[PDB]
Each structure stands twice: as C-alpha cells, then as structure tokens.
Structure 1
Amino acid sequence: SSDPLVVAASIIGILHLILWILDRLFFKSIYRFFEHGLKRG
C-alpha cells in the first residue's frame, strides 16, 4: 500500500519514546535546548 510512510512513522514512534526517556535521563540537553528556545523566542 504506502509501505515507506507507514514504516517511517512507526520508526518515528519508537524515536519519540527514546526522546522522552532522554528528556529525563539526560535532562541537561533539553535544559540547554529549552533555554535556547526561550531566548530566541
């Protein structure tokens, strides 16, 4: 059917679950990233 899109999205769903763990486990990277976003606006 639309196999690359469905596969890529699924891969991305894992990728967000990893990001959510990284946001709390490796907290300082989002601590820097949010500070940059709040500064830049």
Structure 2
Amino acid sequence: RSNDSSDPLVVAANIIGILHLILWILDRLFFKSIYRFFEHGLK
C-alpha cells in the first residue's frame, strides 16, 4: 500500500541543503549579526 519514497536520503538531504543556503546567505548579508552572535549575545 505505501510505495514509500524512492530516494529518502536525497530529499532528507535537500531539506538541510535549502536551510543551509538560507543560513550561508543570511550570514553574507547579516555578517555583522553573526559576529555578534558569537560575541556574547547568550544570556
């Protein structure tokens, strides 16, 4: 009944691939915010 996915590793790997770009790109633009994150910011 359940045909299941024919490539669960590729898709499961795409979700992180996309989120990755959103991060790598968000850093290139907000490179300043990232620098602050490491510097303190945790409280």
Instruction: Give the TM-score of the pair, scaled to structure 2.
Output: 0.51
How far off is 1:13 after superposition?
0.8
Gaps spanning 5+ residues in structure 1: where?
none
CA 1:24–1:5 in structure 2 vs 1: closer, same or farther (change >3 Å)?
same
Q: Percent identity, aligned pairs only?
A: 97
Gaps spanning 5+ residues in structure 2: where?
none
Instruction: Give the TM-score of the pair, scaled to structure 1.
Output: 0.52
Figure out how many residues of one structure are paired with residues of the other and give that number.
39
Per-residue CA deviation, residues 1-33 of structure 1 (Å, 9 max, x unaligned), is: 586665343111111111111111111220111
Asked which structure has the greater CA Rg, the reply is 2
> Which stretches of structure 1, 4 residues or longer, exceed 6 Å deviation after superposition?
2-5
Higher helix share: 1
RMSD: 3.1
Provide the rounded CA distance (Å) in 2 between the counterparts of 1:13 and 1:32: 25
